[PDB]
């Protein structure tokens, strides 16, 4: 009944003032994309930065098993769009937020389905 809770450890580390994980791979792009959260190619809009997905995944970067029961990664091999205001901590952003399954935008950072 024991498994390491990496997400809680990183969140707690952040809340106590630890420096965000760095060397997330930021892509060059036009910043005229759809703004969707996780895409097959960089899709940042003017308010976002696009990053290589694997470098923004806590589980990839920490060399640990993904919580997906089959060990699949939501980010590796794709590009993740991070609001520019949060681009200092892309790993923390992807960990703490969820993608709208309807529109593909980040809940609270693009998804307007609740309008």
């Amino acid at each position: 009944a024991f498994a390491v809770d990496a997400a809680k450890a990183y969140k707690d580390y952040l809340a106590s003032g630890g420096q965000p994980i760095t060397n997330c791979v930021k892509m060059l792009c036009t910043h005229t994309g759809t703004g969707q959260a996780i895409t097959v190619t960089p899709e940042a809009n003017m308010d976002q930065e696009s990053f290589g997905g694997a470098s923004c995944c806590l589980y990839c970067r920490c060399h640990i098993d993904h919580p997906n029961p089959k060990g699949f990664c939501d980010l590796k091999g794709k590009y993740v769009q991070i609001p520019t205001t949060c681009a200092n901590d892309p790993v923390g952003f992807t960990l703490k937020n969820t993608v709208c399954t309807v529109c593909g935008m980040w809940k609270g950072y693009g998804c307007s389905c609740d309008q």
Binding site: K26, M27, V40, E49, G52, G53, Y79
Partner: protein, 300 residues
């Protein structure tokens, strides 16, 4: 001049035709660094400019394209160049990368080990290598052709690059191999390309465009490296990041180039012509299957 707006500079043809002796590389702007866009890694900028230049060549871009990327790890434990390659290549392109040391990657599959351990059942449409050992750079010793991973790369191209495919292999003043230059004469066209963001380095990418599987031209690789250094020594390149701000036409166009499985007896001049124009890839279209040899040791 207007070169500052290009992604980089390719070796002018007249330099390729010289018969120079090898000298030390002495760059006017040695030690200068380009100012990169905020938060952008050198190797993202470098691979972006490489891909921007590759867009100007007659690359074969088939459906079911397969690309292999050697030396893809970084001292950061991530793979910036792989991320750029995957951005550039058409969606669905099979991308394999590899490096000596463990790293986290966006490639479809990653092999960790010496490149000499890497084997593939299939042939490849594009081979990219950023392999480099800084211990080759020794300005106090003679600068001879290097073997090591260059020996592997030469054999790998000849055995596993599809006809019509292309390569980009990183070299420097001291990290180079004469047979690899000789092998550039087995492509329809070739060059040495210097990225504008890294213009103050003797680095270049040695690009072979459209593999013909036989010599189109006999190149002496010792002389050709001397020609490359002579070019670098007499042509300062202004550091520039300008092309990074223009990504509107970055993605490689899915040309849908034909793939055919042909036997050696069937490759006539008309086929060679098609290969030379980026209009044909010759290989099987089977499954992509890779492996890495593992040396087993019991130290008990």
């Amino acid at each position: 001049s207007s070169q500052a707006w290009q992604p980089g500079v390719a070796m002018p043809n007249l330099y390729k035709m010289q018969r120079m002796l090898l000298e030390k590389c002495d760059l006017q702007n040695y030690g200068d660094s380009a100012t990169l866009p905020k938060g952008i890694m050198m190797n993202v900028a470098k691979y972006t400019q490489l891909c921007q230049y590759l867009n100007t060549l007659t690359l074969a871009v088939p459906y079911n394209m397969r690309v292999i990327h050697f030396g893809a790890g970084s001292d950061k434990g991530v793979a910036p160049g792989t991320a750029v390659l995957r951005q550039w290549l058409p969606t669905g392109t099979l991308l394999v990368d590899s490096d000596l040391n463990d790293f986290v990657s966006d490639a479809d599959s990653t092999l960790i080990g010496d490149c000499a351990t890497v084997h593939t059942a299939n042939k490849w449409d594009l081979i990219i290598s950023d392999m480099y050992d800084p211990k080759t750079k020794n300005v106090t010793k003679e600068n001879d052709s290097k073997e090591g991973f260059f020996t592997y790369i030469c054999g790998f191209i000849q055995q596993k690059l599809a006809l019509g495919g292309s390569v980009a292999i990183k070299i420097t003043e001291h990290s180079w191999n004469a047979d690899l230059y000789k092998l550039m004469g087995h492509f329809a066209w070739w060059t040495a390309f210097v990225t504008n963001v890294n213009a103050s380095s003797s680095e270049a990418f040695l690009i072979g465009c459209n593999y013909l599987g036989k010599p189109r031209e006999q190149i002496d690789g010792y002389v050709m490296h001397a020609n490359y250094i002579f070019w670098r020594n007499t042509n300062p390149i202004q550091l520039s990041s300008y092309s990074l701000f223009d990504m509107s036409k970055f993605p490689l166009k899915l040309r849908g180039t034909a793939v055919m499985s042909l036997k050696e007896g069937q490759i006539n001049d008309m086929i060679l012509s098609l290969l030379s124009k980026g209009r044909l890839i010759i290989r099987e279209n089977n499954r992509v299957v890779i492996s890495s040899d593992v040396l087993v040791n019991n130290e008990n």
